[PDB]
Amino acid sequence: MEKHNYESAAEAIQAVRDNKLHAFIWDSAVLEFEASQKCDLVTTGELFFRSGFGIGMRKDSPWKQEVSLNILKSHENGFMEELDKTWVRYQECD
Amino acid sequence: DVDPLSGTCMRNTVPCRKQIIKRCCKGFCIDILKKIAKTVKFTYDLYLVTNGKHGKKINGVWNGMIGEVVTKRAYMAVGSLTINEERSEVVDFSVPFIETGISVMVSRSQVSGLSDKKFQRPNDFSPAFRFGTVPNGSTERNIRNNYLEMHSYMVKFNQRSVQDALLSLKSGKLDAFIYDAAVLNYMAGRDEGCKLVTIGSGKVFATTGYGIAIQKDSGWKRQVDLAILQLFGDGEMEELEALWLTGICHNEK
Amino acid sequence: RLKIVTIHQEPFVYVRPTTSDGTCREEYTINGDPIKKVICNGPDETIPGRPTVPQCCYGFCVDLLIKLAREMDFTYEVHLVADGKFGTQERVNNSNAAAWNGMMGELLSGQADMIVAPLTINNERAQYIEFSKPFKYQGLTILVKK
C-alpha cells in the first residue's frame, strides 16, 4: 500500500477516475458520497476498521452528558435518518 | 438444562438461577461477559429475571432487569437488550458491540422505500396486510412513541414468542415479521429451509447496538468500555461471530 | 458561549466565502427546504500567505449543532481549525512535549471548547477526552470503477 501513495483526497479519487490506479482505499463516509457523485466508480465489500463518529468535549465538561443524551433523542425519532437522507443524495447510482 | 447425572454445568455454560431451580446459561453474550470479567478481573453472580423480561415502562413504573438494576438487586444487566434514550437516561450503558436494530423478515414474494406507508396503512391496500412484533419490547415502545397507528393496528398481530412469531410467519397466516436485526439476521442465516430472508440489504433504521446496564454516574464505567474494544481489538469478535452468529443460510443469493 | 471547531470534510461540511459583506446563499436542498448556513473562520490557501479567513460553512453537523442549540441552552460561534488535519500526536522527545496537532489540540488548548466534525472515535484519543455518543458509524472500504 505504501508504494505509489497520493497526497490528497481529490487526487486519490481522480487516479481511479483517470484509471491511473485500479483501486483506492479510504473510510466510507468520504467515499460513499463520491460513489453517489459519479457512479462510474463503486464501493465494495464490508466496512472494516469500523469506527463511529462523535462530538468531542473535555471529560471535565458536563455539557457532553446532555449532548449524548440529546444525540440518542435525535436517533430515536429518525432525525439522523432524514438528515443522512438529505445530505446523501443518493441521486444517481445502483 | 444441565445433565442431571453430572449435577452441575458443563463447559462454556455458566450457572444462572431463576426464582419460581438452577438453569445453565451459555452463548455469545455469556462468552463476552466472561472475557470482560477476565480482563477487568472481578467475580460475579448470575441469575435470571422473573418479572417483565426486557425493561418496559408501564404507566408510572419500569419493569424487567432494569428494575433489579434500579432496586440495586442487579448492578449490571446483560443480554440482547437494545438501547434507548429513556434507559440511557436512567442507567449508564456500555458501547454497542454489534450492529443491530429494528428490521423485517419476510418470504420471497416488498417495501423498497421501506417507509412507503404501505405499512402505515393496511387499509389503503384492499386485501388486508399483516405485520406484527413482540410486545413489551423497545421496538413496541419506540413504535408507540413515533408511530401510533402502526402500534394500534399491530396489537392484533402481536405474538407470544419469537419461535411462535416465527410460527405465524412460517406456516402462513402472517406475511411479514418485525424484530431485532441481529436476531432476524441470525434467523435469516439459520432456518430449517432457506425460506426466510431479511428486508433489502437488512440495512436497519433505528441503527443501534446491544449495550449493558450499570447503575449511574458512579460505576466501574469506563473500565468496562476499554475492555470491550480490546475484545474487537484482538479480533476475537470476528471468531465469535463465525461461531455463534453466523448462519448457514444467505450464502446463496 | 461555545467555540466550535471543524475541518474541511466534504460530506458533513461545506465551505464557500460569504459574498462580499452579504452572508449566505438561499440555496435549497433537493427536498424543498432552504439550506441553513453559519459563519466560520478558517485556513485559506487562496491567498499565497495563509490568513485565518472569515468564511461561510454549511453542513449536516451544522444542522445537528443548531438542532442541539434549539434543544440546548447554548449559543454557538464556529471557526475551522487552522490545520487541515483533525489531530495527531507529534513533535518533541523530552518528557512528553507539545501536543497532537489539529482541532483536537485546540480542544485541549481550549481554542474551541467543543468539536463538531466527522471524527472517528478511538481509545488512544479517548483517554484524553470525553466523546459524545455516535451520531453515525462507518468504516474503511475500496473504490473501483464498475
XYZ file of C-alpha atoms in Angstrom:
493
model
C 0.000 0.000 0.000
C 2.863 2.340 0.885
C 4.013 2.239 -2.737
C 2.503 4.842 -5.093
C 0.761 6.886 -2.376
C -1.227 10.072 -3.165
C -1.075 13.373 -1.234
C -4.772 14.328 -1.046
C -8.333 13.004 -1.412
C -9.137 14.627 -4.746
C -6.052 13.204 -6.415
C -6.779 9.780 -4.932
C -10.312 9.686 -6.340
C -9.017 11.095 -9.611
C -6.461 8.338 -10.104
C -9.239 5.729 -10.185
C -11.326 8.084 -12.333
C -8.299 8.760 -14.558
C -7.774 4.982 -14.305
C -4.171 5.589 -13.292
C -4.794 3.370 -10.259
C -7.122 0.344 -10.345
C -8.177 0.612 -6.678
C -8.488 3.225 -3.901
C -8.771 2.646 -0.130
C -10.448 5.096 2.247
C -13.087 5.336 5.000
C -16.644 5.168 3.727
C -18.070 8.497 4.891
C -15.838 10.443 2.495
C -16.064 7.709 -0.175
C -19.775 6.752 -0.456
C -20.831 10.334 -1.139
C -18.393 10.296 -4.071
C -19.755 6.867 -5.061
C -23.116 8.573 -5.426
C -21.454 11.574 -7.078
C -20.078 9.650 -10.074
C -21.444 6.051 -10.150
C -18.700 5.426 -12.696
C -16.913 4.319 -9.549
C -18.220 1.930 -6.892
C -17.557 0.987 -3.282
C -17.182 -2.690 -2.484
C -17.130 -5.129 0.399
C -17.911 -4.587 4.060
C -16.777 -1.584 6.067
C -13.809 -2.787 8.092
C -11.898 -0.841 10.721
C -15.438 0.120 11.714
C -15.392 3.392 13.630
C -18.241 5.604 14.815
C -18.103 9.396 14.738
C -18.905 11.791 17.578
C -18.602 15.286 19.046
C -15.517 15.957 21.169
C -15.539 17.508 24.650
C -13.232 17.573 27.671
C -14.077 14.975 30.322
C -14.417 17.810 32.826
C -17.254 19.487 30.904
C -20.729 18.145 31.910
C -22.469 19.527 28.812
C -21.398 16.408 26.933
C -23.636 14.456 29.337
C -26.578 16.295 27.807
C -25.088 16.037 24.312
C -25.088 12.256 24.253
C -28.462 12.384 25.987
C -29.570 14.642 23.150
C -27.821 12.578 20.450
C -29.783 9.489 21.464
C -33.000 11.532 21.476
C -32.153 12.579 17.928
C -31.562 8.969 16.903
C -34.856 7.557 18.157
C -37.074 9.937 16.187
C -35.212 9.249 12.938
C -33.854 12.788 12.739
C -30.465 11.439 11.708
C -32.006 9.087 9.144
C -33.706 12.036 7.449
C -30.535 14.137 7.673
C -28.411 11.433 6.035
C -31.268 11.083 3.557
C -30.994 14.793 2.758
C -27.197 15.025 2.611
C -26.621 11.625 0.999
C -28.110 12.178 -2.452
C -28.016 9.499 -3.445
C -29.463 10.762 -6.760
C -27.916 8.515 -9.427
C -26.285 5.108 -8.835
C -27.144 1.459 -8.154
C -30.931 -27.764 31.143
C -27.842 -29.305 32.728
C -27.216 -33.060 32.701
C -28.839 -34.406 35.900
C -26.248 -37.180 36.189
C -23.493 -34.553 36.130
C -25.362 -32.439 38.679
C -23.613 -29.240 37.572
C -22.966 -27.139 34.453
C -20.643 -28.235 31.659
C -18.060 -26.439 29.508
C -18.843 -22.863 28.454
C -22.146 -22.887 30.312
C -22.185 -20.644 33.371
C -24.812 -21.058 36.114
C -27.871 -18.814 36.346
C -30.731 -19.160 38.832
C -34.406 -18.328 38.347
C -36.757 -17.835 41.293
C -40.092 -19.541 40.658
C -34.090 -24.114 40.152
C -30.646 -23.913 38.542
C -30.529 -23.188 34.803
C -27.384 -23.163 32.660
C -26.810 -20.043 30.575
C -24.408 -20.079 27.631
C -23.761 -18.276 24.363
C -22.346 -15.181 22.698
C -23.196 -12.719 25.481
C -22.028 -15.184 28.130
C -18.618 -15.501 26.472
C -18.341 -11.724 26.081
C -19.195 -11.266 29.767
C -16.635 -13.919 30.684
C -13.919 -12.179 28.668
C -14.751 -8.715 30.027
C -14.682 -10.067 33.574
C -11.425 -11.896 32.839
C -9.806 -8.704 31.578
C -11.056 -6.446 34.385
C -10.531 -9.307 36.880
C -13.630 -9.365 39.090
C -16.046 -12.032 40.297
C -19.795 -12.038 39.725
C -23.102 -13.828 40.404
C -25.510 -14.521 37.510
C -29.285 -15.069 37.712
C -32.427 -14.891 35.560
C -35.123 -12.236 35.607
C -38.686 -13.122 36.591
C -40.807 -10.000 36.178
C -41.279 -8.398 32.756
C -38.345 -9.738 30.706
C -36.810 -6.775 28.838
C -37.232 -3.411 30.526
C -40.610 -1.779 29.934
C -42.237 1.435 31.109
C -45.849 0.771 32.057
C -47.792 3.761 33.350
C -45.574 5.202 36.061
C -43.296 2.208 36.628
C -40.442 0.304 34.927
C -40.201 -3.491 34.622
C -37.679 -6.220 33.792
C -33.942 -6.474 34.523
C -33.841 -2.692 34.740
C -35.961 -2.957 37.877
C -33.309 -5.131 39.507
C -30.755 -2.572 38.332
C -32.807 0.194 39.960
C -33.646 -1.853 43.054
C -29.888 -2.466 43.212
C -30.719 -6.162 43.043
C -28.565 -6.118 39.935
C -25.553 -3.892 39.418
C -25.247 -4.587 35.702
C -27.769 -6.236 33.368
C -26.562 -8.280 30.387
C -28.410 -9.734 27.393
C -29.869 -8.952 23.963
C -31.128 -5.698 25.491
C -31.493 -2.846 22.993
C -30.626 0.801 23.753
C -32.946 3.823 24.044
C -32.961 7.402 25.376
C -35.035 6.633 28.489
C -32.812 3.810 29.729
C -29.639 5.738 28.898
C -31.193 8.483 30.997
C -31.799 6.197 33.981
C -28.674 3.998 33.697
C -25.276 4.303 32.001
C -24.836 1.933 29.052
C -21.845 0.125 27.576
C -20.795 0.890 23.992
C -22.517 -1.238 21.339
C -20.619 -4.420 20.463
C -22.776 -5.419 17.485
C -24.616 -3.758 14.611
C -28.340 -4.326 15.077
C -31.742 -2.647 15.328
C -35.333 -2.926 14.152
C -35.778 -4.944 10.951
C -38.061 -7.107 8.866
C -38.076 -10.805 7.994
C -40.255 -11.978 5.114
C -40.710 -14.686 2.479
C -39.609 -14.211 -1.158
C -42.741 -12.631 -2.647
C -41.952 -5.734 -0.830
C -41.065 -2.327 0.622
C -38.242 -0.719 -1.330
C -38.788 2.673 0.214
C -39.415 0.695 3.425
C -41.162 3.838 4.678
C -43.612 3.606 1.763
C -46.626 3.869 4.098
C -47.900 0.560 2.782
C -47.010 -0.340 6.348
C -48.538 2.972 7.523
C -51.901 1.846 6.307
C -53.043 -1.712 5.529
C -56.425 -0.304 4.592
C -55.076 1.533 1.538
C -54.419 -1.928 0.120
C -57.736 -3.727 -0.397
C -56.576 -7.101 0.812
C -55.701 -6.908 4.495
C -51.969 -6.806 5.059
C -50.267 -8.219 8.132
C -47.223 -7.462 10.245
C -46.518 -7.858 13.942
C -43.885 -7.729 16.657
C -43.279 -8.934 20.207
C -44.904 -6.705 22.890
C -43.224 -5.105 25.901
C -40.243 -4.538 23.576
C -38.078 -1.472 22.984
C -39.364 -1.804 19.438
C -43.015 -1.604 20.512
C -42.393 1.332 22.871
C -40.471 3.156 20.141
C -43.285 2.430 17.694
C -45.891 3.806 20.091
C -43.719 6.876 20.614
C -43.209 7.737 16.939
C -45.947 5.900 15.010
C -49.269 5.461 16.817
C -51.452 3.964 14.073
C -48.919 1.201 13.475
C -48.992 0.252 17.164
C -52.777 0.409 17.479
C -53.137 -1.734 14.358
C -50.347 -4.207 15.133
C -51.649 -5.053 18.613
C -53.845 -7.667 16.892
C -50.804 -9.153 15.147
C -48.640 -9.233 18.284
C -47.177 -12.669 19.036
C -46.327 -14.626 22.196
C -42.720 -15.596 21.441
C -40.077 -15.432 18.708
C -40.500 -19.148 17.976
C -44.264 -18.549 17.874
C -43.947 -15.263 15.948
C -41.952 -17.448 13.609
C -44.893 -19.859 13.638
C -47.129 -17.047 12.379
C -44.701 -16.239 9.572
C -43.661 -19.800 8.624
C -46.969 -21.665 8.408
C -48.720 -18.762 6.722
C -51.497 -16.602 8.235
C -48.960 -13.789 8.504
C -46.992 -12.021 5.775
C -44.192 -10.043 7.403
C -42.467 -10.213 10.773
C -40.578 -7.418 12.501
C -37.946 -7.841 15.198
C -34.400 -7.111 16.301
C -31.956 -7.021 13.381
C -29.257 -9.255 14.853
C -31.805 -11.930 15.741
C -33.506 -11.560 12.361
C -30.152 -11.843 10.572
C -29.080 -14.906 12.547
C -32.517 -16.396 11.867
C -32.022 -15.432 8.231
C -28.841 -17.484 8.308
C -30.419 -20.217 10.417
C -33.641 -21.761 9.119
C -34.811 -25.364 8.557
C -35.062 -24.335 4.926
C -33.867 -21.023 3.478
C -37.484 -19.864 3.231
C -36.811 -16.666 5.198
C -34.752 -13.577 4.366
C -34.101 -10.033 5.589
C -35.537 -6.821 4.194
C -33.468 -5.162 1.478
C -29.810 -5.372 2.488
C -31.067 -5.806 6.032
C -29.943 -2.227 6.468
C -31.879 -1.235 9.550
C -33.475 2.022 10.598
C -33.097 2.991 14.260
C -29.472 1.913 13.934
C -28.452 0.604 17.339
C -26.346 -1.935 19.189
C -26.589 -4.080 22.306
C -25.480 -2.291 25.467
C -25.054 -3.248 29.123
C -26.605 -1.700 32.240
C -24.754 -0.007 35.116
C -26.293 1.972 38.000
C -25.461 5.622 37.420
C -22.525 8.042 37.070
C -20.813 6.058 39.819
C -19.684 2.752 38.364
C -16.725 0.762 37.088
C -17.914 2.504 33.953
C -15.072 3.396 31.587
C -13.027 0.374 32.690
C -15.711 -1.820 31.143
C -15.728 0.166 27.902
C -11.996 -0.180 27.325
C -12.248 -3.936 27.859
C -14.954 -4.083 25.200
C -12.855 -2.520 22.478
C -9.934 -4.724 23.462
C -12.175 -7.635 22.507
C -12.523 -6.462 18.927
C -9.040 -5.034 19.288
C -7.602 -8.521 19.228
C -10.154 -9.603 16.625
C -11.928 -12.113 18.867
C -15.373 -10.807 17.921
C -14.982 -11.977 14.321
C -14.257 -15.516 15.502
C -17.138 -15.415 17.979
C -19.307 -14.092 15.150
C -18.393 -17.012 12.919
C -19.100 -19.477 15.724
C -22.247 -18.082 17.378
C -23.774 -15.535 14.989
C -23.020 -16.933 11.538
C -25.892 -18.822 9.951
C -25.554 -21.278 7.100
C -28.227 -19.590 5.048
C -27.938 -16.472 2.952
C -24.787 -17.845 1.375
C -26.967 -18.244 -1.686
C -28.129 -15.013 -3.384
C -20.711 30.653 24.642
C -19.359 27.644 22.764
C -16.364 27.956 20.479
C -16.736 25.243 17.875
C -14.064 23.932 15.556
C -14.236 21.850 12.403
C -12.243 20.580 9.441
C -12.941 20.680 5.743
C -14.641 17.373 5.012
C -16.927 17.410 2.001
C -19.979 15.357 3.020
C -20.594 16.752 6.516
C -19.129 20.243 5.949
C -19.115 22.690 3.030
C -17.095 25.878 2.604
C -17.910 28.932 0.485
C -16.946 32.501 1.268
C -19.690 34.983 2.135
C -20.356 37.048 -0.974
C -18.744 40.404 -0.215
C -20.256 41.509 3.093
C -23.514 39.663 2.327
C -23.733 36.404 4.241
C -25.221 33.172 2.911
C -26.989 31.750 -0.142
C -30.675 30.808 -0.156
C -29.691 27.606 -1.965
C -32.159 24.800 -1.435
C -31.924 21.094 -0.644
C -33.184 18.504 -3.141
C -36.181 18.100 -0.868
C -37.574 21.601 -0.972
C -36.076 23.331 2.023
C -33.764 26.326 2.164
C -30.210 25.364 3.152
C -29.141 26.611 6.566
C -25.681 28.142 6.982
C -23.306 29.667 9.565
C -20.090 31.742 9.627
C -16.721 30.018 10.243
C -13.173 31.395 10.457
C -10.652 29.001 8.952
C -7.466 28.459 6.967
C -7.402 29.828 3.442
C -4.936 28.606 0.833
C -6.328 31.024 -1.766
C -4.036 33.838 -0.673
C -0.323 32.972 -1.003
C 0.156 33.563 2.720
C -2.391 31.773 4.896
C -4.761 34.154 6.765
C -7.439 32.890 9.116
C -10.284 33.836 6.818
C -13.940 34.615 7.500
C -15.998 32.054 5.582
C -19.483 30.598 5.262
C -19.877 26.932 6.204
C -22.986 24.778 5.930
C -23.337 21.142 6.945
C -25.041 18.067 8.367
C -23.039 18.654 11.526
C -24.163 22.294 11.452
C -27.840 21.384 11.207
C -27.202 18.953 14.053
C -25.446 21.668 16.036
C -28.287 24.160 15.625
C -30.768 21.357 16.365
C -28.932 20.975 19.634
C -28.839 24.786 20.008
C -32.623 24.950 19.880
C -32.704 21.943 22.233
C -29.790 23.162 24.381
C -29.421 26.416 26.315
C -26.141 27.140 24.495
C -25.222 29.624 21.766
C -22.597 28.833 19.123
C -19.747 30.530 17.295
C -17.730 28.359 14.925
C -14.280 28.685 13.402
C -12.469 25.999 11.405
C -9.133 24.807 12.786
C -6.006 26.312 11.226
C -4.531 22.890 10.483
C -6.287 20.840 7.817
C -5.721 17.788 9.985
C -8.213 16.909 12.731
C -5.430 15.811 15.015
C -2.407 13.554 15.672
C 0.214 13.301 18.441
C 3.587 14.742 17.394
C 6.765 16.821 17.951
C 9.396 16.834 20.656
C 11.056 13.988 22.580
C 11.780 15.272 26.114
C 9.174 14.372 28.760
C 6.078 14.412 26.676
C 6.368 17.537 24.579
C 3.877 19.658 22.664
C 0.530 18.114 21.790
C -1.331 16.498 18.928
C -1.533 18.948 16.024
C -5.034 19.911 14.883
C -8.565 20.727 16.057
C -8.351 18.190 18.853
C -5.292 20.099 20.063
C -7.477 23.194 20.005
C -9.968 21.352 22.217
C -7.419 20.542 24.898
C -5.937 24.019 24.484
C -9.433 25.455 24.779
C -9.234 27.345 21.490
C -12.521 25.605 20.895
C -14.416 24.184 23.865
C -16.334 21.698 21.722
C -15.509 19.921 18.434
C -18.161 19.363 15.772
C -16.850 17.459 12.758
C -16.764 13.948 11.260
C -14.415 12.438 13.862
C -13.949 8.653 14.247
C -13.900 7.553 17.865
C -10.820 5.676 19.203
C -9.259 4.737 22.607
C -5.907 6.466 22.061
C -7.785 9.762 21.814
C -10.458 8.572 24.268
C -8.298 8.718 27.408
C -7.524 12.389 26.761
C -11.128 13.465 26.141
C -14.809 12.674 26.582
C -16.671 11.503 23.493
C -20.291 12.067 22.561
C -22.417 9.088 21.600
C -22.030 8.439 17.876
C -24.351 10.286 15.532
C -23.023 7.979 12.812
C -20.739 4.987 12.262
C -18.752 3.978 9.180
C -15.617 2.082 8.188
C -12.937 1.802 5.523
C -13.681 0.479 2.059
C -12.449 0.393 -1.514
C -13.423 2.309 -4.630
C -13.076 0.644 -8.039
C -14.777 1.551 -11.332
C -17.869 -0.535 -12.089
